[PDB]
Amino acid sequence: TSWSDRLQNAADMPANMDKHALKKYRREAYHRVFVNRSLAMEKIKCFGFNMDYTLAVYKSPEYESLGFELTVERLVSIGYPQELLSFAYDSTFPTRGLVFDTLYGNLLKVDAYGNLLVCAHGFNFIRGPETREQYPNKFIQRDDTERFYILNTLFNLPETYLLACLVDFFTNCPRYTSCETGFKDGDLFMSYRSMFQDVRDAVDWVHYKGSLKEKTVENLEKYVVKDGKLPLLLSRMKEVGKVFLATNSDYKYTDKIMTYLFDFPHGPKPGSSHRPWQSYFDLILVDARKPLFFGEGTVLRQVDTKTGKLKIGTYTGPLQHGIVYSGGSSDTICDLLGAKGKDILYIGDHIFGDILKSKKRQGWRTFLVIPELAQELHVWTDKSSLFEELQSLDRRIKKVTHDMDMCYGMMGSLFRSGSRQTLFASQVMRYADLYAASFINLLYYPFSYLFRAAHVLMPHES
Amino acid sequence: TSWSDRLQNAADMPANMDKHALKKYRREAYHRVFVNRSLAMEKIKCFGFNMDYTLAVYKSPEYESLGFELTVERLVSIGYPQELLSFAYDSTFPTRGLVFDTLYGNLLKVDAYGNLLVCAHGFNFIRGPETREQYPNKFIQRDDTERFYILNTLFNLPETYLLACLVDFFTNCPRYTSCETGFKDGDLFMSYRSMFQDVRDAVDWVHYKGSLKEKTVENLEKYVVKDGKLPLLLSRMKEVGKVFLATNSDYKYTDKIMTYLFDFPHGPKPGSSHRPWQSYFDLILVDARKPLFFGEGTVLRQVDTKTGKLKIGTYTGPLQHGIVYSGGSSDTICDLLGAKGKDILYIGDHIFGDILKSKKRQGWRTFLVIPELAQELHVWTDKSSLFEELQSLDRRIKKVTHDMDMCYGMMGSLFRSGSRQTLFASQVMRYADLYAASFINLLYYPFSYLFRAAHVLMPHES
Amino acid sequence: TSWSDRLQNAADMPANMDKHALKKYRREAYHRVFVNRSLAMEKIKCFGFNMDYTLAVYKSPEYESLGFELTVERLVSIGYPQELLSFAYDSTFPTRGLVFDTLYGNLLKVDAYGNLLVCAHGFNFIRGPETREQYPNKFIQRDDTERFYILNTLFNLPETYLLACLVDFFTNCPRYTSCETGFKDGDLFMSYRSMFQDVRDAVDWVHYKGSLKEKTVENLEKYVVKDGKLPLLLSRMKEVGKVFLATNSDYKYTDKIMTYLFDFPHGPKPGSSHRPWQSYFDLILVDARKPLFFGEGTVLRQVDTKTGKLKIGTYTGPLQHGIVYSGGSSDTICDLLGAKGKDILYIGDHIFGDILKSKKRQGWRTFLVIPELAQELHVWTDKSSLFEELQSLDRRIKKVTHDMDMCYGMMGSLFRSGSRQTLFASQVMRYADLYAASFINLLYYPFSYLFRAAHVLMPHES
Amino acid sequence: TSWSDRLQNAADMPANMDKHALKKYRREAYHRVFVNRSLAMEKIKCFGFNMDYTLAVYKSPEYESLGFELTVERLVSIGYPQELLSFAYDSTFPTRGLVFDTLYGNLLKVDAYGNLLVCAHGFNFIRGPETREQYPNKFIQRDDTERFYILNTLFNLPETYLLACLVDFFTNCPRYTSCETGFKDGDLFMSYRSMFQDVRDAVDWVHYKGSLKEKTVENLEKYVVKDGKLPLLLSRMKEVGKVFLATNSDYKYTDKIMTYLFDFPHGPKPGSSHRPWQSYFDLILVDARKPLFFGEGTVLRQVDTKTGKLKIGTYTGPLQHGIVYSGGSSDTICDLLGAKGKDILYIGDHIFGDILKSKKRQGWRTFLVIPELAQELHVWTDKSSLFEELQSLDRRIKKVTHDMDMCYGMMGSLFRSGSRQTLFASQVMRYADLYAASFINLLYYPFSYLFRAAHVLMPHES
Ligand SMILES: O=c1[nH]cnc2c1ncn2[C@@H]1O[C@H](COP(=O)(O)O)[C@@H](O)[C@H]1O
Ligand SMILES: O=c1[nH]cnc2c1ncn2[C@@H]1O[C@H](COP(=O)(O)O)[C@@H](O)[C@H]1O
Ligand SMILES: O=c1[nH]cnc2c1ncn2[C@@H]1O[C@H](COP(=O)(O)O)[C@@H](O)[C@H]1O
Numbered sequence A, B, C, D: 001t002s003w004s005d006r007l008q009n010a011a012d013m014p015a016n017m018d019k020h021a022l023k024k025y026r027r028e029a030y031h032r033v034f035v036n037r038s039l040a041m042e043k044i045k046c047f048g049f050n051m052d053y054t055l056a057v058y059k060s061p062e063y064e065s066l067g068f069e070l071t072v073e074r075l076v077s078i079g080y081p082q083e084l085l086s087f088a089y090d091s092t093f094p095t096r097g098l099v100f101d102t103l104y105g106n107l108l109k110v111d112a113y114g115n116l117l118v119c120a121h122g123f124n125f126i127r128g129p130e131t132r133e134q135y136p137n138k139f140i141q142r143d144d145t146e147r148f149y150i151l152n153t154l155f156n157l158p159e160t161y162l163l164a165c166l167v168d169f170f171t172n173c174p175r176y177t178s179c180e181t182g183f184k185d186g187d188l189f190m191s192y193r194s195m196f197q198d199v200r201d202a203v204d205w206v207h208y209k210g211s212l213k214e215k216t217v218e219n220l221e222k223y224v225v226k227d228g229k230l231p232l233l234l235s236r237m238k239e240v241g242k243v244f245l246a247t248n249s250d251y252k253y254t255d256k257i258m259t260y261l262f263d264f265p266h267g268p269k270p271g272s273s274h275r276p277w278q279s280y281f282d283l284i285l286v287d288a289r290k291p292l293f294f295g296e297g298t299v300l301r302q303v304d305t306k307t308g309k310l311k312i313g314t315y316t317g318p319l320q321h322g323i324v325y326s327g328g329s330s331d332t333i334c335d336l337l338g339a340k341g342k343d344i345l346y347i348g349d350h351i352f353g354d355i356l357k358s359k360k361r362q363g364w365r366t367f368l369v370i371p372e373l374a375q376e377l378h379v380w381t382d383k384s385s386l387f388e389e390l391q392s393l394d395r396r397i398k399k400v401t402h403d404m405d406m407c408y409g410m411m412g413s414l415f416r417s418g419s420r421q422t423l424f425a426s427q428v429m430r431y432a433d434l435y436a437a438s439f440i441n442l443l444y445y446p447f448s449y450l451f452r453a454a455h456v457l458m459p460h461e462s
């Protein structure tokens, strides 16, 4: 049972919009919206959405496993050895938010302060004394973005597993010699840094120039969660505010995925005429180039929707019905929709590119979708007595931590190793005002709900 | 009753080192060490200290008021009008941590997200609708360090008041015309930006080239809190670890202040021979240039203590008894003292230069000294029923906020406006593992105390 | 009669290596090597060559005209209007070395000081008073590389003509409105800057991703000058030194062009066995990335010549027989060939990327190939009495200038407008120790010839 | 006989303004204006002047020798050893335009291409084979401004000699150990780089904070060439155009030097009333900060001439009679005087800061004053048969070079070593349209003289 199975199960359920039925549904953790900071839903005038892994959640492990195959095939085709062809995606290995250390070739799970929670070299989990040889303070400086790359999005799950596979392969294949910073193959030296850059380029190539997009769209039911409650939520949003789409994808791919997402023999609810996906948005923006979009952006262009190409030049006109934009900046959205940052609830899956930057640069309200939450809630419930056991204790602590972490996968929970929160958890708490396994969870809260978090107090104020 | 009066009152008390007496003393909030993250004191192998506003706390309002006088006199001497001579420091106006907006000339108190809590133009406190003309989202982007300057240290209190004085003066003096971004005086235009830069340069000049240092040292009892419990704490630290001094000051000024701090007719405790301040430190480092010190630093130099000048060239030798260093980097300290970051407790007053950067770049443990805490605790206790009143309510909320804030000063508490925490409070909670009104508060905790904070839980984990 | 016709005519001649025959051949200007600074050929230990427009000279106007077609077709395919399909390359318009001003959309011919010699907007040649409206000092700052792009290589001839075509088209087509800095088309604004960037991207695309390479190689006799005296020159060079190839092209394209260049039923001279092009070089380097190659370069890679792909990793081995490199830096060549800069004669066609940078950064000796020289010599000879007329005079001067310039083309000679040298001429004189219509001209000078230039004297030394 | 003796001798002569007398005076090389590019004096509408070493030429060796003393005294006062007190300025050692190599501690004389003409380590002149150990291609990359500092102005003559003195001292004093890149003194390592930076800082300190200015002004006849023909030239310029002053000095120092320069009991010519120096300029600009002045400049300020301080704020008014400016940019001058670049003749002594940058960034016409030319002309005349001997020859060549160079000093002529022009000579030829031993030489040419240089021809055009 992947998280995307939980999501698709919930997606198959029709919406019961009775006030008491809604209220008891959002009792279950699966269907709750979680609050880091109070947000009064009546003050929200625009709802904005991202597409990939937000509106269009890809099925797991099938989609990761497709991207993994195509990235391997790309690497083999530029000269990596054929043995790579015998790797196969294992979803039980990668957890999201790991850090790849390009100097030494390790995947690290760290807390908000750069302290090491887990260190794996290939598939070899390194323990305290051995880690201290490479990390003498058991700490890394995350600001060293030339050395450390943070594998933040669900698109990075294939490459997280692939780096481990590759380091394991070259370490154990007797053609190569392992050195501190890479592999020697006769007179060629492959550093973990340039290996990492190859994987990163191959992933980029597969999305921009290979066959990932074509293969997804030819089998949409296989690859993409679909939910008849989406047009219902969006039309309800439109009754009280404006709705916008902002995606890093191009128009042609967005049109295919979005058409699929709305492909029901009805519109908002059973019995209603179907309407085109575009009719649900006051503003549609493609090729956004987030996070840059939240700074100086790029030039605002207009899409020619007949052909899927950009019209030539910068668009200088007003918002018109049926127009599709490309590029621009977050200011374009505020200006064309007449909104201030705090009037905007932006719903996205990318902790950095969607959530952190819209919050820090623009003061937008934020909703983080976390697809793995669908499954991590289920593990957190039926391992309560395991977390609670660890909680009491605070040697046996190291053992408890281990079997707690293992239920989630080899790299543990997305949110913690034992009693220590991950970097990713702190940034969720820090930047996401609201968060949930799915944005559909908003459907179960009334129009003007006040989401509440307890006021925060310093230690001396308590 | 300034905070420095509270501190000096506590400083006048001899140390009663009876176990039960220590224990009940640290019951009082004034004498407590507050914990943001757990810290096991037995794992600490080096204690490091900063000097200004940490070991050497300057008396308030007298020292701020001296710096204010000298900065005014500097500005008049380069051509500011003589009316400045009639400003006088008012300690009830500035709160620490304000932001000066150089575009529009406002002092702002903001939260961690850049939301506006208070906006003052000169001495005119701007309310919601008027602020929205210049701040349409009531939010500023703190990353815009060219526009916004954060007045973070206790050294900035004079200039915080001075900017307000200056904006008030030019606004109301009919020789000048007020524009959005500055003042017109015939054919001269003075922007708030270049006005701000003048004040900043004048402050710099007074510390580096004027008479602030000479006037402080000629009346040390007037300007500097002194405490016979300091050599006691430091000698106790030395029994279990190494002790180091790292200051941005030069040697000559440090020698004068430190000699004064230890000037008692005894050493660690009454009856013991006096010893030179230098004997209390394993390592003394001046001209540190923090925060840069916590990155690439500068070249390690050696002070000639006979003359107070640097010897020529880079010092390449080992740690020797009686040597005084200048410049270097935090790595110099780790290497010469044989420590890893987490073995180091660094005690400082500068949230950025001491605390944030040693934590983020190096993984040091951190103790933030907050001198105003001596007084803010006293206000927080006898206005409990005023905070608690506000707490219940959550119109009357706006009124409660106001009379809560006013008890602290015109710019409110250092930690909050009402129910909204300031930027400075969040960074304390974020970067300072421990914090107190004074580092002397450590004296009241046993050698191997475990400071405890409750493990943190996400909303879905609760 | 294009310059490539002159070159191919000379190429068809067999080499007569009799001492007196060589000597009288290099009497003719067509076959001379010209000297800016003295160079003693006996001190040269390595001869290095670039490939495109140096060893492999493309036929004119056919190759420019092919690149022009494909760039137009690329632009139409991303959305430029179909009328572009009716442009056709005119070789009489562009001269090499022009500057495109992206602010105002003009092509400029300038001197070494940035003074304007010619200004054309589309096909409209602007005269003094009108130019002064946009260039009030009749001068541009060439260091403003964001505004001004210098169209330096023979690869830029198509785009030089295309920019003029495009500016002429949009100016005269009544769908668009001409503004100072671009064209308005309803609510789209196309700036000359973003238009320029489109052309530049299209040219890049045609070379990297389109069909220019495939179409050249399928009709090599149509597109590329071939000369049986090339293997003769190279084998003679090899008798006295080392020979190397350094190209920005990839291996596969270099292998096709070079195989073609050596495709004769003989080797160095008639009667000798043919040998593979590779046997003529001590060192072959592809994907050089000049000019960066002359600074920090990139990582030295090794080509797999079976497949045409790079082997994985950085090459750490020595120079071996038959190995082909990719990337690296100029230091790689010095180290593997055991040369110092001044031992190296580097032969190239790119004034900046080949000549200027090897001279300034490394102290290499330089030979600039200037294909248009084949024809400009012919114009300079039979318009002697026209230059000489202008020379005497120094109103009629403006008229003489005009009909002098016109014999070369609409944008005049590559080297001057009348009595004023171009930027390109000064940089030739400044950076190219030697220069010629072809590097084959070296064949006509003995092994240890001393090329002589008169010592230079300041005005007060004369 | 220093060059300043030649200049002061010529300065003592009254002006004979008879047409035939002027004409035969400018026959002598001492009184000629030399032409690199043609300049029609009638097209010049503004004459601009720099002050130091242009209008105010300091006497040699006395002024260099004063700056040398004060820089030594500064270095000793921060801790350099007392032996420095026994250095004494030797004017026969330094030539202007040398390069200090901070890696190895050598002074180099180079040509325009970075080729080594002379290499001295302290006072030890290194010959070919020994130089090749540190410079294997006998070439340096001048663009490496972090390694190489070019000692371009007459203000740098003291420090050129001082670096040599210092390297000689530490090399031969047995307290220090010589390494490749500096000196070891026990546990202190002094690199040539940080030694160089000390000298540079000391020179800066002496000009900005020490006693050089005070000591010059208290003995103006000792330190500064004065010439009654200056007000005559300037008033004649004012009859046909505008005249401006632009200096890097402050107002107070400029007022003292300029008052001195005009201190005659008459104005333009004997018998005329004296007028204040300020009356000779349409525009006076101090604190120019050239070369930055020729790019974005700084904010235009107005000097308060009563006090010598800046008025507060940016000056927004027009040009008014009697106003003195500070800062600004070259555009300020063009706008306030209504000039285009080519209407401006700018007269300066700094090859980079005055001449190169006004020419390259703005298209100004340029006149370089070269005080040493007064003496180098005298050496060039009575060593004609020595240069001419070298000229014919082109072993004995190395010997001729040596005794040619020696007549100028230990570092040879400013313009050449033998038959090889220096960097400084090429930049004179490149950037200075006109040049002379003194700007007063303009007095001897009529109002509308056309200065002529022969049109330049490429080798293939000849
Ligand atoms: O690592 C990557 N390399 C290249 N493209 C990516 C990568 N990750 C996500 N994308 C693209 O980003 C787009 C989704 O962005 P979103 O709708 O704003 O979430 C999709 O079109 C993906 O192909
Ligand atoms: O704003 C300022 N301008 C110039 N110097 C300052 C300023 N604030 C603090 N200082 C200096 O910094 C030194 C104290 O640094 P600390 O011991 O590391 O806290 C003192 O010598 C102060 O003069
Ligand atoms: O403007 C251009 N855009 C992209 N590639 C270019 C351009 N101009 C030249 N090239 C490529 O540069 C290579 C030739 O470089 P060369 O042998 O070093 O002269 C050829 O493969 C060309 O395709």
Ligand SMILES: O=c1[nH]cnc2c1ncn2[C@@H]1O[C@H](COP(=O)(O)O)[C@@H](O)[C@H]1O
Pocket (backbone or CB within 6 Å): D050, D051, D052, D053, D155, D203, D204, D205, D207, D208, D246, D247, D248, D249, D250, D253, D290
């Ligand atoms: O190396 C130096 N360090 C500091 N000031 C210098 C130096 N060289 C020249 N100056 C100053 O520059 C001013 C002269 O600039 P000028 O009139 O524009 O030539 C004088 O006031 C000198 O003190």
Ligand SMILES: O=C(O)[C@@H](COP(=O)(O)O)OP(=O)(O)O
Pocket (backbone or CB within 6 Å): A143, A356, B360
């Ligand atoms: O969250 C971020 O964007 C930065 C800034 O945090 P503040 O400066 O806002 O504390 O923290 P980093 O990840 O570099 O530790």
Ligand SMILES: O=C(O)[C@@H](COP(=O)(O)O)OP(=O)(O)O
Pocket (backbone or CB within 6 Å): C360, D143, D356
């Ligand atoms: O003279 C200068 O300012 C630069 C530029 O010369 P061009 O680029 O104008 O040839 O030459 P450098 O001194 O760096 O060799």
Ligand SMILES: [Mg+2]
Pocket (backbone or CB within 6 Å): A050, A051, A052, A053, A054, A348, A349, A350
């Ligand atoms: Mg997304």
Ligand SMILES: [Mg+2]
Pocket (backbone or CB within 6 Å): B050, B051, B052, B053, B054, B348, B349, B350
């Ligand atoms: Mg401090």
Ligand SMILES: [Mg+2]
Pocket (backbone or CB within 6 Å): C050, C051, C052, C053, C054, C348, C349, C350
């Ligand atoms: Mg080429």
Ligand SMILES: [Mg+2]
Pocket (backbone or CB within 6 Å): D050, D051, D052, D053, D054, D348, D349, D350
């Ligand atoms: Mg000067």
